[PDB]
Design an enzyme around this catalytic site. Sequence first.
Site, PDB file in Angstrom:
ATOM      1  N   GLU A 123      50.425  20.569  -5.932  1.00 45.63           N
ATOM      2  CA  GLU A 123      51.513  21.242  -5.218  1.00 45.63           C
ATOM      3  C   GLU A 123      52.867  20.739  -5.790  1.00 45.63           C
ATOM      4  O   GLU A 123      53.520  19.929  -5.102  1.00 45.63           O
ATOM      5  CB  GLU A 123      51.405  20.930  -3.682  1.00 45.63           C
ATOM      6  CG  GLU A 123      50.147  21.190  -2.818  1.00 45.63           C
ATOM      7  CD  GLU A 123      50.160  20.550  -1.385  1.00 45.63           C
ATOM      8  OE1 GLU A 123      50.242  19.330  -1.230  1.00 45.63           O
ATOM      9  OE2 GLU A 123      50.095  21.275  -0.386  1.00 45.63           O
ATOM     10  N   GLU A 214      59.578  25.235  -3.726  1.00 43.37           N
ATOM     11  CA  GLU A 214      58.167  25.126  -4.040  1.00 43.37           C
ATOM     12  C   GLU A 214      57.493  26.470  -4.196  1.00 43.37           C
ATOM     13  O   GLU A 214      57.617  27.356  -3.343  1.00 43.37           O
ATOM     14  CB  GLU A 214      57.461  24.383  -2.946  1.00 43.37           C
ATOM     15  CG  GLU A 214      56.079  23.854  -3.258  1.00 43.37           C
ATOM     16  CD  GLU A 214      55.526  23.019  -2.105  1.00 43.37           C
ATOM     17  OE1 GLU A 214      56.314  22.461  -1.345  1.00 43.37           O
ATOM     18  OE2 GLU A 214      54.307  22.921  -1.955  1.00 43.37           O
ATOM     19  N   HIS A 263      51.440  16.973  -4.953  1.00 37.70           N
ATOM     20  CA  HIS A 263      50.185  16.542  -4.337  1.00 37.70           C
ATOM     21  C   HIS A 263      48.981  17.215  -4.963  1.00 37.70           C
ATOM     22  O   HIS A 263      48.922  18.443  -5.046  1.00 37.70           O
ATOM     23  CB  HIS A 263      50.056  16.868  -2.868  1.00 37.70           C
ATOM     24  CG  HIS A 263      51.174  16.445  -1.948  1.00 37.70           C
ATOM     25  ND1 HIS A 263      51.083  16.235  -0.631  1.00 37.70           N
ATOM     26  CD2 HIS A 263      52.452  16.177  -2.344  1.00 37.70           C
ATOM     27  CE1 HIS A 263      52.285  15.845  -0.266  1.00 37.70           C
ATOM     28  NE2 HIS A 263      53.090  15.814  -1.279  1.00 37.70           N
ATOM     29  N   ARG A 329      49.863  11.523   8.360  1.00 33.19           N
ATOM     30  CA  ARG A 329      50.672  11.855   7.157  1.00 33.19           C
ATOM     31  C   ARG A 329      51.689  10.708   6.992  1.00 33.19           C
ATOM     32  O   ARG A 329      52.832  10.673   7.441  1.00 33.19           O
ATOM     33  CB  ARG A 329      51.477  13.177   7.282  1.00 33.19           C
ATOM     34  CG  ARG A 329      50.722  14.470   7.610  1.00 33.19           C
ATOM     35  CD  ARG A 329      50.675  15.575   6.544  1.00 33.19           C
ATOM     36  NE  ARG A 329      51.930  16.253   6.206  1.00 33.19           N
ATOM     37  CZ  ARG A 329      51.978  17.562   5.912  1.00 33.19           C
ATOM     38  NH1 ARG A 329      50.938  18.382   6.058  1.00 33.19           N
ATOM     39  NH2 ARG A 329      53.122  18.083   5.483  1.00 33.19           N
ATOM     40  N   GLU A 347      43.100  15.605  -0.241  1.00 32.75           N
ATOM     41  CA  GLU A 347      44.419  15.769  -0.810  1.00 32.75           C
ATOM     42  C   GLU A 347      45.057  14.425  -1.127  1.00 32.75           C
ATOM     43  O   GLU A 347      45.324  13.639  -0.222  1.00 32.75           O
ATOM     44  CB  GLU A 347      45.312  16.514   0.151  1.00 32.75           C
ATOM     45  CG  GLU A 347      46.580  16.854  -0.579  1.00 32.75           C
ATOM     46  CD  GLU A 347      47.684  17.273   0.339  1.00 32.75           C
ATOM     47  OE1 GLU A 347      48.295  16.405   0.935  1.00 32.75           O
ATOM     48  OE2 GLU A 347      47.942  18.459   0.455  1.00 32.75           O
ATOM     49  N   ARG A 349      48.311  12.640  -1.735  1.00 30.02           N
ATOM     50  CA  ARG A 349      49.742  12.898  -1.626  1.00 30.02           C
ATOM     51  C   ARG A 349      50.697  12.148  -2.530  1.00 30.02           C
ATOM     52  O   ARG A 349      51.831  12.603  -2.667  1.00 30.02           O
ATOM     53  CB  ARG A 349      50.212  12.641  -0.224  1.00 30.02           C
ATOM     54  CG  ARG A 349      49.522  13.487   0.794  1.00 30.02           C
ATOM     55  CD  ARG A 349      50.307  13.415   2.066  1.00 30.02           C
ATOM     56  NE  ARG A 349      50.561  14.751   2.565  1.00 30.02           N
ATOM     57  CZ  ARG A 349      51.797  15.204   2.795  1.00 30.02           C
ATOM     58  NH1 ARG A 349      52.922  14.583   2.411  1.00 30.02           N
ATOM     59  NH2 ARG A 349      51.927  16.400   3.334  1.00 30.02           N
TER      60      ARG A 349
HETATM   61  N1  LIG Z   1      38.050  23.829  -2.788  1.00 28.83           N
HETATM   62  C1  LIG Z   1      39.234  23.394  -3.256  1.00 28.83           C
HETATM   63  N2  LIG Z   1      39.266  22.333  -4.077  1.00 28.83           N
HETATM   64  C2  LIG Z   1      40.444  21.912  -4.547  1.00 28.83           C
HETATM   65  N3  LIG Z   1      41.655  22.392  -4.311  1.00 28.83           N
HETATM   66  C3  LIG Z   1      41.578  23.446  -3.483  1.00 28.83           C
HETATM   67  C4  LIG Z   1      40.459  24.002  -2.928  1.00 28.83           C
HETATM   68  N4  LIG Z   1      40.791  25.082  -2.128  1.00 28.83           N
HETATM   69  C5  LIG Z   1      42.084  25.158  -2.224  1.00 28.83           C
HETATM   70  N5  LIG Z   1      42.633  24.202  -3.026  1.00 28.83           N
HETATM   71  C6  LIG Z   1      44.062  23.987  -3.349  1.00 28.83           C
HETATM   72  O1  LIG Z   1      44.754  23.661  -2.143  1.00 28.83           O
HETATM   73  C7  LIG Z   1      45.786  24.653  -1.886  1.00 28.83           C
HETATM   74  C8  LIG Z   1      45.878  24.862  -0.373  1.00 28.83           C
HETATM   75  O2  LIG Z   1      47.159  24.626   0.197  1.00 28.83           O
HETATM   76  P1  LIG Z   1      47.151  24.663   1.793  1.00 28.83           P
HETATM   77  O3  LIG Z   1      45.830  25.499   2.098  1.00 28.83           O
HETATM   78  O4  LIG Z   1      48.338  25.419   2.272  1.00 28.83           O
HETATM   79  O5  LIG Z   1      47.007  23.291   2.336  1.00 28.83           O
HETATM   80  C9  LIG Z   1      45.354  25.864  -2.694  1.00 28.83           C
HETATM   81  O6  LIG Z   1      46.527  26.504  -3.030  1.00 28.83           O
HETATM   82  C10 LIG Z   1      44.753  25.222  -3.937  1.00 28.83           C
HETATM   83  O7  LIG Z   1      45.775  24.747  -4.801  1.00 28.83           O
HETATM   84 MN   LIG Z   2      50.187  18.769   1.042  1.00 25.54          MN
HETATM   85 MN   LIG Z   3      55.942  20.559  -0.396  1.00 26.36          MN
END
Ligand SMILES: Nc1ncnc2c1ncn2[C@@H]1O[C@H](COP(=O)(O)O)[C@@H](O)[C@H]1O
Ligand SMILES: [Mn+2]
Ligand SMILES: [Mn+2]
Lengths: 445, 445, 445
Positions: A123, A214, A263, A329, A347, A349
């Site tokens: 991110e 972003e 992140h 967090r 995740e 961070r």
């Molecule tokens: N199964 C997964 N493994 C790794 N990264 C993922 C996966 N699913 C989603 N993501 C990443 O996490 C982001 C989700 O952001 P958010 O759902 O808003 O927390 C997606 O845009 C991808 O970049």
């Molecule tokens: Mn995040």
């Molecule tokens: Mn951000």
Amino acid sequence: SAEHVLTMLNEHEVKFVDLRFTDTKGKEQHVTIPAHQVNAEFFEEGKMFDGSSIGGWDMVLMPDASTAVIDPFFADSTLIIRCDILEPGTLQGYDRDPRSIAKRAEDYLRATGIADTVLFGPEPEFFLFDDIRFGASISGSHVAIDDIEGAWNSSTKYEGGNKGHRPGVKGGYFPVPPVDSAQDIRSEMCLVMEQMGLVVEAHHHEVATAGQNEVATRFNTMTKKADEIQIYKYVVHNVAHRFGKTATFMPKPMFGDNGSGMHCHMSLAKNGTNLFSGDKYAGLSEQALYYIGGVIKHAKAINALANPTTNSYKRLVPPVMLAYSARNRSASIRIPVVASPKARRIEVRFPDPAANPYLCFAALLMAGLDGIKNKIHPGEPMDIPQVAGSLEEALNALDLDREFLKAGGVFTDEAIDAYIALRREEDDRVRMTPHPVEFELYYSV
Amino acid sequence: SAEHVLTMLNEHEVKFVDLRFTDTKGKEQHVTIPAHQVNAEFFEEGKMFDGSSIGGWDMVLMPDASTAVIDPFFADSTLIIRCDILEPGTLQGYDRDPRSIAKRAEDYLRATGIADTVLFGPEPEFFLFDDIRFGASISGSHVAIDDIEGAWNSSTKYEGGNKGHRPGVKGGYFPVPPVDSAQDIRSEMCLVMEQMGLVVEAHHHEVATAGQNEVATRFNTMTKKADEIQIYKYVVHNVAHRFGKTATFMPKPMFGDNGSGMHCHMSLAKNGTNLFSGDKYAGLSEQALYYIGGVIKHAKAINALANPTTNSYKRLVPPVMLAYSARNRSASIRIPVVASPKARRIEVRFPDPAANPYLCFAALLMAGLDGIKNKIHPGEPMDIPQVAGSLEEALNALDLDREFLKAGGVFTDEAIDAYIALRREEDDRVRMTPHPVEFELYYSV
Amino acid sequence: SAEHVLTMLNEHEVKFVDLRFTDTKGKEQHVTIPAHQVNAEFFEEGKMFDGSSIGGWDMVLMPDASTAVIDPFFADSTLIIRCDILEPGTLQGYDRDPRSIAKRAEDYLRATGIADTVLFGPEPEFFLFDDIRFGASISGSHVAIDDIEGAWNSSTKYEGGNKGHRPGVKGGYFPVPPVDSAQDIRSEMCLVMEQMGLVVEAHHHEVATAGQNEVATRFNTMTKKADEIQIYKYVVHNVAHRFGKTATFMPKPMFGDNGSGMHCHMSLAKNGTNLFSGDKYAGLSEQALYYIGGVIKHAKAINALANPTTNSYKRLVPPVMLAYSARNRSASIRIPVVASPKARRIEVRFPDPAANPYLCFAALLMAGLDGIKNKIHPGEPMDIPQVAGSLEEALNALDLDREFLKAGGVFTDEAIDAYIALRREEDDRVRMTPHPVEFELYYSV
Ligand SMILES: Nc1ncnc2c1ncn2[C@@H]1O[C@H](COP(=O)(O)O)[C@@H](O)[C@H]1O
Ligand SMILES: [Mn+2]
Ligand SMILES: [Mn+2]
Ligand SMILES: Nc1ncnc2c1ncn2[C@@H]1O[C@H](COP(=O)(O)O)[C@@H](O)[C@H]1O
Ligand SMILES: Nc1ncnc2c1ncn2[C@@H]1O[C@H](COP(=O)(O)O)[C@@H](O)[C@H]1O
Ligand SMILES: [Mn+2]
Ligand SMILES: [Mn+2]
Ligand SMILES: [Mn+2]
Ligand SMILES: [Mn+2]
């Protein structure tokens, strides 16, 4: 395939081909060929260049024809082709080339049979300024940041008039136009990213005054995502430029407001199934918990690659806590409440946009596997150890915790040693140059 | 042929014909005729001009109709025709005309039967600045270089805003836009070069901050390549101009960063086969080794022609080592690792864009043949003698090592003596004018 | 004597004592003691200092009480005492200290019995400017000279009005006020020089526009005269300063007008009689002719000490001729038509004010003795060999013609080698920095 690139050339009246690659520091390099030099021989035996003047490195550029994209910005029709740096004649791939290292980390994952694919979702945040001036000389040093959205311009005379709708210092998070000046610049960046093969999910203004933004982008397999970060950054730097702005991915440009972090969401998968989903804490598998344990075990060596700038640590001052949680967090490892099915993931961070996306992702993966591989059980969720407190610390730590990176030939000792050598030269210049607040603190001593 | 030029005139509604030639210093001269004066008589008996006011020289301009190109820049349709300077009536060709000398060196190669053709591949580098000011007067002297990419402008106020993406001092080598400002200017220079008959192979930014660039171009036979360098330079100087920049081929404009060199790749060929390929060091023939031995034997006299400016030697300060190698880029003779077949060649790294491409290439060839001709065996590869340390040195050396240039009438004594006379006047002005760092060094004496 | 210095302290209510010495380059250094630290112990065992940060060198400063002078400029009463640098404890005198070397050359003259005393009479010229600006940086370099007398200010607007009486470029030689602006500054310099123990003979404006001046001063024995040159220069630099001017002893500040030279008149004497007087050419002895022969024999090694700056050679461009004459002022050795009795002497015209007066005079003497010592007969008067054409040349020459300086321990090899090392660093900075007329000459290459 070569065949496909060769049709695009006619299909787009492509005048030039831009050979691109990333260096150890993470900057995309490029050299340009007339389209009329792309033929069989080229995709077969690559193009020779002097690798010598690349920081930390004759060599051969091997075009990866799967990567061909048309450049949305150059005036003459140009097809971008990403390359790998190979060792010449012998043609194996420089053990210092970050793309090669990423590819090796993916194959090593396969060879361990722990899963078939690694999924990364970075991110990256950026700043969009109007004017940036800085300099250092014997007689002094300075940096001057300016942007129309800077809360500090509330007092400024502008000759069009001042108009005053502007994000306050931690108030950039979310107000509609006119307070958010960048809606059209971010939407345009989304449209050009997709034209270059990325999938945008969302774009918004971030917390900081003075242009933090972003663009959220759909995940990918590790080396493909690392290249998508190199395209992400190129589009941000150039669309911003077309708009009369200047973008920067440095972690901490302003004291007293938000830093730009990157992140990394991570996930592992074997035969179409998400190994990180399971029973255990918050839908996680035991497999996933050992991944977290490996990241936390190697966090300070990972910081040398995921936070590689002295400025990085101005951001990482008291997500410093090496702890996992769905709640805290404050914990540098967040377990996202997916709720949804088997989009289960961890995740991390703490990394930031200054990181070389190939080496940063390779090191997160190699640490995470070493967790699994040795049942390094993470612990309990904070709802207590910390990241390296400085680049010097992080570099010492990579130097000593060198083993997990060397697994299966992903990263050689020469590769790790040359890296630390580059990052040290940088740390020294910052260490030996007197800082402006030191005059504030110590002139009347 | 004349016939062909005469059709182009109608085929392009050509209003004017530009007669062009190069002088001893290497600057392309020109005079313009209305197209309606080009007829039989012209290509037969040339056009008379006053050769007297050309530096170091009534004479006759003999149009070489093989050279006709349409000018990409003049407002009215103009056909450029390169000329040779002939001795009038008698019509043999001025022994001081650099094109004639190049042609003579090619025929002498043929007459020795060592090979039928000489192939040259010059790699000229240039700088692309926005503003260049300089001057010398009794009360002082100065030079002021400025360009948007100059690392020194990081602190500069610009009124559009500063934007800060800029190549650091040795960091011009390779970063993508926006750090590299010249992608569109270099691509355009490639397109106009090909429109003038050159074949571009690659274009990229070079090592230096403040606009160092390179357009890589396909080889040719010696006098044809020397003319392609005169077109190369014309297109760079004029496209840069259309873009609001100013280009310069001087060897060393800035202290503390890269100089612009023009490396000559050379190769010899008899009946369609490359004499430089063979067994011996790195795929070379014994024939090739004696060529290297001749270049090294005559290197300081070659410097008077290949490095003809006092500024040239600010670049050549400790590729100074007269040594061949496939490994040591410190050795002024690099044997390129072709790997590929019989594109085997030598590369002399020391000449620079200030050199008269005709006299520079003629002297490299004549030295290389004298090696072959006398089995002057080069030695062993550095993996130790040096180039002239100054123009005065280089001029003394050409004056004494005069013989190998006079072989077969390529270069007369008057030709060599007038050349040294010009280069001396220049060396004196630079020697007798007090330098700014001398005030830094010696004012408080 | 110590006794005498100790009375002056009370006799002048001296608050401070200024310990002074000269370094290898020729610049007078100083350190200040409160008068209350001058007592027996001091003149006995000297004062320790860190000799380490002196260019080209713990050590001991040994006060020479014969040299005590009151400083005409410092606000508080100060007595200047010149010192010798001695090797500590062992107390012999640094073989790198230029004063020591001068004293050794005088004793060696005595030990050879050729004469008891050497007499030197330097004619140092200087420039008196109002403003001098200069600088060198990556992006450029400059020097800007300004003075009210500069012929170039004829066009200048001044707000008092311009008044226009000013020396033209070679017209500074002799016009009365108001054209000569410096009558009161030169008379004042004469009065303060005599107050410091010098004997003025004449003062006048020199040939150059923009402030060239000369204060002519009565001769002395070699080391005493070398110290009188260090006082001469101090008074010129500081009186000029009190007058709002800035003085400089550099050899060639302006191109196109006169340089500042320091001609050394020399003479030898045994038991109150002038050995240079005699029969032979123009009243000279055979003894004197061999002195000239030694100077001419070693002239290029002498240039490394008598013309020690790169700027020195901008002056020495075609008194370059190594020839003696009473007629040819083109000959660097002038035999002055004394007419008068046995004030017979030789005059060497080539040295300049940048020279270290100790090492310059020591080297002229040692060369002159080597002539005598080996009957090196000079030749015939021009009414043909030249001085070193550059500092690099002069330094090579000192390095090879090292022997005559080493005679009797005057100058060690370490001393000569460290000297050349300093002068080389300087020559390099001037060699590697691009000169402003090179842009004039070569930008449009
Ligand atoms: N199964 C997964 N493994 C790794 N990264 C993922 C996966 N699913 C989603 N993501 C990443 O996490 C982001 C989700 O952001 P958010 O759902 O808003 O927390 C997606 O845009 C991808 O970049
Ligand atoms: Mn995040
Ligand atoms: Mn951000
Ligand atoms: N056989 C040859 N003889 C002489 N020059 C050559 C030959 N082949 C190629 N060149 C030149 O060398 C250049 C090669 O640059 P590079 O291959 O990148 O080292 C070509 O662009 C030509 O200018
Ligand atoms: N016997 C001597 N030996 C050496 N230098 C002398 C001698 N007599 C005079 N001089 C110097 O030569 C200068 C004469 O200048 P001028 O007589 O005008 O040519 C005097 O000021 C002294 O510096
Ligand atoms: Mn290059
Ligand atoms: Mn090369
Ligand atoms: Mn004088
Ligand atoms: Mn004189």
